[PDB]
RNA sequence: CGGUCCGGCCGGGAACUCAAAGGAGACUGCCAGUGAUAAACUGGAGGAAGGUGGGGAUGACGUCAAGUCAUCAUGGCCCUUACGACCAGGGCUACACACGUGCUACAAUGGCGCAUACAAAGAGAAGCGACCUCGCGAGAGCAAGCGGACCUCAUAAAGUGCGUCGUAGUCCGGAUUGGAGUCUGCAACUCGACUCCAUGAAGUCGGAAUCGCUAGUAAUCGUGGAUCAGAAUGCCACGGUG
């Protein structure tokens, strides 16, 4: 993949990160039934303020690698190529050819 | 005196205890006719017992698990088989010949890769 | 098949009567493994023959049987310019196979609104040595003494 | 749709801006690439250039455009027929 | 008493490891209960092995994790002390739970 | 487009992992990120260093790397000189303590990375091609390997056409499982493209 | 078997000749047996004329034939004076919902109209 | 067994199921016949299994200058204040049409309503999420337990039993559309899924033509997982009937 796609998930990380305390905050004001509507009015005028990178939904698990973002597998962090190239290597523990 | 076989078939595992009585078949705690809402399994549960002459003769106290209706009529069979042939063992020419003693060892296939099921290939044309 | 000619797998009797016939016949009544309805299908059309003929339920299906097991049918060979159809001695497994295939096929072909009514009431045409079942077989025979030129 | 708990969704950009053009009572073209927020009623009067990708289309706000979204009022795909 | 779980990918491994501590807590302390087998995860994978276009070419790998339960029925000061002490090989990951 | 990796076929059998470790999947792709990291900065490191197995092992939190190696002397030079200067940057990188073990490679000639590497080198240093198959196969079989497959492929002396060749002595049987077969593939980066190398060692057969 | 203007055959049960009426269903037929004690089992056969007097007020208290038909129509000339999306794809007859127009459309499109 | 709140529940017990680990077992091994005393074939005998037991993995030299420089890598060429980089919005979902692959159907071997029985295999910590309460409902609140043979996803459905419809474009079918909503997520207009009420298209078994399948198979019935905030009729797996 490229290197600006590669910087651009780095920092959607960073951000979702730094203000993952303050936008769950927000959120259990909005969904907390027991609060006042111009709270909640606020806190989702302030969830509007915060940018959008902050959130978790936006970035997108790359391969670790090489920043493929499709083939993803979450276990190994890897697409399913170089997953493959591990595994035929011996790279990877306790992993074979099945049968059954 | 309660003589033992182990029973099974398609996923399913019978354990079946044989007390020589009347002819009493519980099944789980319940009877014949209540557990198997059906007319064929309760003929294969019958059917070495009237192979040979032991409706009246054996009580029994079966416990079944995993499968299906004919999955545990089955195991059933078959441990009835076993347990018979543990308690007599000159049954084992007649039940042979039945094909009783032999446990039926059709497993369901896996799906396999590129078929929708284990032998259906996908639809195929040219064009 | 081309290397061998196979040997077949046993069949169940059924728990009502012990026929391995009628098992047979609930086998090719029965569509997507639902055999619990085809056996109670059969079941109640022969309770309504027997009703309506005072034998056995399995002696006025050997009977409906009887009048529709062909003799002798026909197979496309075509080794010159057109279609020879050539007959041949059928077998009695095909010929109780055949059988109880066109039955089923009228049984739902008719209009009755039960399939024990349709499967009922074409039994008992086919006792009577009327009906679809019976036209079918009298059209194989038809075409049998038609080419019977051809041996 | 949304749920009722949250509310309706706005821009705050927007509702600045309407907040604005009510208090002055100007009908001058507020250009927008809200799409996304839902029209209020303090909003009824006000000429408001919806962006549609290529450019932005004036809405004139009805009474009847409050429980919708700007983007409604701006078609991104023009289509006029194929002969 | 002392519930010990081990997990890992080589079952040789894990009885190599499970009989060692058994007889390690035998000599030491008492009433090791027994190696109790639990069942094995088969964590199965399927991947397409074309970098580009081919759908229906996959590999279809696994891995299994062996499990292993060993129970130690009277701790003595020792029993306890000299069985953490004792190490064992890499891919086995150990588990104690007292009570 | 046709052949199963050996290795990874072999894995069960007769060949280990070149990482025994075991993880959650909390720790387990971190793991892996953390061995890929190491074993490319020890090969561009030890790239004249005759490296071919590079073992990684984590036990209770600290990494365990054995290098399996040609030969020792230029890794190590004084006993944890270049051994601790690398260990001290695999600590770093793996962010657990380090440990190094040298495993030495008798028999150089029979190690399937060593000989596609040492083809590459030659390749990239412009020889024919063919002599250094010969002579790789030749000094394998002479140093008692029962059988030897190497192969190379495309822009072959600067050839615009792509095409692979490929020598065997012995007998190398891939389908036969409990075969040791040592197999591993090199990479020549020639001024013409990519000259691929790939090498099958039959040792014998595992009575297992 | 004359309700709310319309007539309901007399032979049907009691739900399904109320699902005659445009603006009920089998729930709401549920409800509206329910609010008069009537069995949903028996005709419109066999009912004394003040069951059917209970089943025309408790009918009466929706919206039906008439009052819903115009209501409807009025939604969507609400949309076509807007002139939104959904008004749009209602007068170019397109389907509103977010459904593909690539392929299978047939029901807001009709049958296929050849190139000739 | 002994005891019970009748629930392996509770003392207990280790046989049984099961769980793994190791091992045995089937080898034309035996008997007869044929065969060129060969290879081998046919049969039966036992046996859980008989001749490759079943299923998988495993894909020779090479072919198509097949495919992929958009996984990656890379010779060379090109751009370098742009062919590079950042952001908002839009688009990849368009629609006179044509094709492929699928899903649901045209019903009575069925639809509905009530009651009720039997699975396997899997996933789970920024997660699975009981119980209880509210809501017709999707769901909401409080909230245990669980890194999990312990807890959760999670009641399997088809089936069976009774009643019902009684051959109709129907109590089939569910498209489409209106209204009211829930959840996810900064955010569901373009462009999400789901729920409720209403709506109730075509369709009454499919032209020439054509596809799959030889046994636990097809057919049919449900289940789970990956990807994933959310979003499958797809994919990969699982068992039921057969
Ligand atoms: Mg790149
Ligand atoms: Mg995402
Ligand atoms: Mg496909
Ligand atoms: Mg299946
Ligand atoms: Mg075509
Ligand atoms: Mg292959
Ligand atoms: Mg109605
Ligand atoms: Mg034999
Ligand atoms: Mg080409
Ligand atoms: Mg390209
Ligand atoms: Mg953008
Ligand atoms: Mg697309
Ligand atoms: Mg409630
Ligand atoms: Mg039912
Ligand atoms: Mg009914
Ligand atoms: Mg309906
Ligand atoms: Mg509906
Ligand atoms: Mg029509
Ligand atoms: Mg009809
Ligand atoms: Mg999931
Ligand atoms: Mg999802």
Known sequence: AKQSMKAREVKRVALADKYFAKRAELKAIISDVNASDEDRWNAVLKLQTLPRDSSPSRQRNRCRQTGRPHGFLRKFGLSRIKVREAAMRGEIPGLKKASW | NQYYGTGRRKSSAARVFIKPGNGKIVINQRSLEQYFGRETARMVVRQPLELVDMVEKLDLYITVKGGGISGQAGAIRHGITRALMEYDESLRSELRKAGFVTRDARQVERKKVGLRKARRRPQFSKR | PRRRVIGQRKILPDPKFGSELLAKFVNILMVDGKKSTAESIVYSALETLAQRSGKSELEAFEVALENVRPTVEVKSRRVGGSTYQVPVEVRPVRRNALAMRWIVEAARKRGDKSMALRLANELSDAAENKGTAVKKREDVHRMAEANKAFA | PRSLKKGPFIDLHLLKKVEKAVESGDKKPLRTWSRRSTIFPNMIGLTIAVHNGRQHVPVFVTDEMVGHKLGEFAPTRTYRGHA | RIRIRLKAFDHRLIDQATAEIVETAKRTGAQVRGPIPLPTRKERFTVLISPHVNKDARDQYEIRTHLRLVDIVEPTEKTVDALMRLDLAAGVDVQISLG | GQKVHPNGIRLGIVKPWNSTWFANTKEFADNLDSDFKVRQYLTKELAKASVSRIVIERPAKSIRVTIHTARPGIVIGKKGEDVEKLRKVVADIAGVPAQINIAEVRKPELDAKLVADSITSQLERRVMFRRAMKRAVQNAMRLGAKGIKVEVSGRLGGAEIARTEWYREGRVPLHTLRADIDYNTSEAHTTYGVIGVKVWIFKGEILG | ?116
Do not use: W
């Not at chain 7, 009426?21 to 066999?46: F, H, M, N, Q, W």
């Not at chain 7, 004394?48 to 089943?55: A, F, P």
């Not at chain 7, 009025?74 to 919902?97: A, F, N, T």
């Open chain 7, 1 to 116: 078997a004359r309700i709310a203007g319309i007539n309901i055959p007399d032979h049907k049960h009691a739900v399904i000749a109320l699902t005659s009426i445009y603006g009920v269903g089998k729930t709401r037929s549920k409800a509206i047996l329910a609010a008069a004690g009537i069995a949903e089992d028996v005709k419109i056969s066999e009912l004394s004329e003040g069951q059917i007097d209970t089943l025309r007020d408790e009918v009466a208290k929706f919206v039906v034939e008439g009052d819903l038909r115009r209501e409807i129509s009025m939604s969507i000339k609400r949309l076509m004076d807007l002139g939104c999306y959904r008004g749009l794809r209602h007068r170019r007859g397109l389907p509103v919902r977010g459904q593909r127009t690539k392929t299978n459309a047939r029901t807001r499109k009709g049958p296929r109209k050849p190139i000739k």
